[PDB]
Amino acid sequence: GMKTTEYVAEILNELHNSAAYISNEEADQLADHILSSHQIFTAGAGRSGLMAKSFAMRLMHMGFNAHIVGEILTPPLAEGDLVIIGSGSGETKSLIHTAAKAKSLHGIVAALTINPESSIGKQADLIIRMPGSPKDYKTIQPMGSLFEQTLLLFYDAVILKLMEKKGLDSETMFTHHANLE
Amino acid sequence: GMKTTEYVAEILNELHNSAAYISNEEADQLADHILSSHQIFTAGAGRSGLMAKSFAMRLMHMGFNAHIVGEILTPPLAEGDLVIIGSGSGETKSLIHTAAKAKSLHGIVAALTINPESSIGKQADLIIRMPGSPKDYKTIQPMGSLFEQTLLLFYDAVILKLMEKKGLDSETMFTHHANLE
Amino acid sequence: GMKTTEYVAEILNELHNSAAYISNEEADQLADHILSSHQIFTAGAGRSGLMAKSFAMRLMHMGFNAHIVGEILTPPLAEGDLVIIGSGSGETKSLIHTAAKAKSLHGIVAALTINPESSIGKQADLIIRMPGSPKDQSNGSYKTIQPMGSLFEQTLLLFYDAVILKLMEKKGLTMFTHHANLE
Amino acid sequence: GMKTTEYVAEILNELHNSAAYISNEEADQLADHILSSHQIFTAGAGRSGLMAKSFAMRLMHMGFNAHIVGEILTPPLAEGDLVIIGSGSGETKSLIHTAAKAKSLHGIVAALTINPESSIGKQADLIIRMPGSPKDQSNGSYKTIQPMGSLFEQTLLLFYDAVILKLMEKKGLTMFTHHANLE
């Protein structure tokens, strides 16, 4: 039984404990792939899909050629482009298909998933392993909320790293944002 | 009282009678604006919005720099870009705003609307007048169905005209379609 | 080569052919199913998907419990619910999945497609066959000057809007007070 | 300059500041309103809009009649319904419209914003003030190394997920059988 604001603290504490189990060799590699790929696609189902979109948007703001798998105006992938798949289970059929198709086209696949031996993980060129396996990790939140929150924060850290690599600062960064609404 | 297939014929007959009141000077101009603008944005609310998206998609397939107002990855408009607004009423507040903002940025606005003296029509550089004013036009369909259907067919005719101008044929046209699903 | 208004005429010309081809017997079953199923789900990919959204919207307007497969707020399907899938080829991988999954849940699947023997057509309880088969082509019948599946998508829209009319007929529905009022 | 995992730590550091700032009294009213209103509508633009969708999805999962302003299938708001608007600046033109329209329909409007005197904040029945005012800046309190409204959007997500917990507490809800099963 507790205050709404106290629940915010409990989440932040789950996030802090959980995020502090993510490995950095893989992450810094993801930034490097984003920097060298001509197009970047993000992907996810459900709420993870929302976090993908949030990451693609910020990538576009920074001037990258970023897209989201499954949207009306998604362009074709070409050889060497990157696909970033956020999936807790690593078993979502649609996402398994996206990874396979990417690979068939000689795209590069990065997967952020709990289980690296999952269907999606086994297709990936790069795996960023997220916490939450049967080994470890506490959460009082609904089914996949912690993973989804972790996805967002991790995406937004990759944004910071990209900013650093590009010598960009928050106060003065030019953003390519929509201007018709 | 009638067969489902008979209702299809009645719709086609409303469409045929209705579409045969559209003026061609304005239309051919829209194609010409699409051909010369570096970016094209489409826009609409509700079902008209769906037709906008359907038109933007086909524009992208043909290699144009096409976007839809209000989507996650919509880029900024620049001077000289085109905004194509489909609105029956010409009074939707959000669309009035999009037109005004476009104009402030020195974009070009084309409006497909029933009432050229509407809020959206008065902002437009180009008006394609659609049938259905108090003067004319029969429809046994729900509120805005005929206008929405007419929008689709008109968009798809502009596609044909663009194909013609570009010396493209349906059987052999290269399309830039999504390839990850 | 041709006025834009002349292309409209051509497009109309092609849709008239498509309408005469459609078997009303299957079409009429569709509306019956919409009227009896507690939930209705529409689906498609790309433009066909846009036409599925347009239909679901009008079903909602009529007071049906209508949904679109794949959206954030889509609820679970329960036994006896209807899923309506528009697919030209009947081979789109996501939609094969949706059809097979619906069937496994004992949903009723209605497929609108060119190929009744396609992967999606074979899962369907009801098939609404649209024109454009390699057969109707080589044998003189079907011709489109439009790209890709444009004629099919157009036919979908028009067919779905015709189904709305049949529904309104069957009911007493104007009473479109089910329209959004926010934003 | 810093490891990606070090940036995660920094982001967390900023969210902790934002949580201590939030007045629980207003937060608690939000959940009360969610529990009493027959329909709940969420809204936002851009990323904030994504967080509004994430919240609406979880409300649906809990069996609430939840909707997202601006979607194809969004139903009309009726008197007494709740609209929850996330906006940093409280000046986004569409959202000003949504708030004023909701109020005119006698909906209840809850605004989550940095500026309670913003256009949206002035329409709100309930305001959940988030940090980041020019004041909290110049006076030492608020600092972000992240672009644009990233910290605010993150705070929104986390705040909405906290509200879910309070709702689950208040109820007996696991019983997330309200999850999509098609596709």
From Swiss-Prot, chains A, B:
Induction: By formaldehyde, under the control of HxlR. Not induced by methanol, formate, or methylamine. It catalyses: D-arabino-hex-3-ulose 6-phosphate = beta-D-fructose 6-phosphate. Keywords: Carbohydrate metabolism, Detoxification, Isomerase. The active site is at E148 (proton acceptor). GO terms for biological process: carbohydrate derivative metabolic process; formaldehyde assimilation via ribulose monophosphate cycle; response to toxic substance. Disulfide bonds: none annotated. Its EC number is 5.3.1.27. Belongs to the SIS family. PHI subfamily. Homotetramer. This is 3-hexulose-6-phosphate isomerase.
Swiss-Prot record, chains C, D:
The lineage of its organism: Bacteria, Bacillati, Bacillota, Bacilli, Bacillales. The keyword Magnesium does not apply. One of its GO terms (biological process) is response to toxic substance. Induction: By formaldehyde, under the control of HxlR. Not induced by methanol, formate, or methylamine. Belongs to the SIS family. PHI subfamily. It holds the Pfam family SIS. Catalyzes the isomerization between 3-hexulose 6-phosphate and fructose 6-phosphate. Together with HxlA, may act as a formaldehyde detoxification system. The active site is at E153. It catalyses: D-arabino-hex-3-ulose 6-phosphate = beta-D-fructose 6-phosphate. Transmembrane segments: none annotated. Substrate binds at S48, S87, G88, S89, G90, E91, T92. This is 3-hexulose-6-phosphate isomerase. GO terms for molecular function: 6-phospho-3-hexuloisomerase activity; carbohydrate derivative binding. Residues 30-173 form the SIS domain. The keyword GTP-binding does not apply. The gene is hxlB. Its EC number is 5.3.1.27. Homotetramer. Pathway: One-carbon metabolism; formaldehyde assimilation via RuMP pathway; D-fructose 6-phosphate from D-ribulose 5-phosphate and formaldehyde: step 2/2. PANTHER family: 3-HEXULOSE-6-PHOSPHATE ISOMERASE. Keywords: Carbohydrate metabolism, Detoxification, Isomerase.
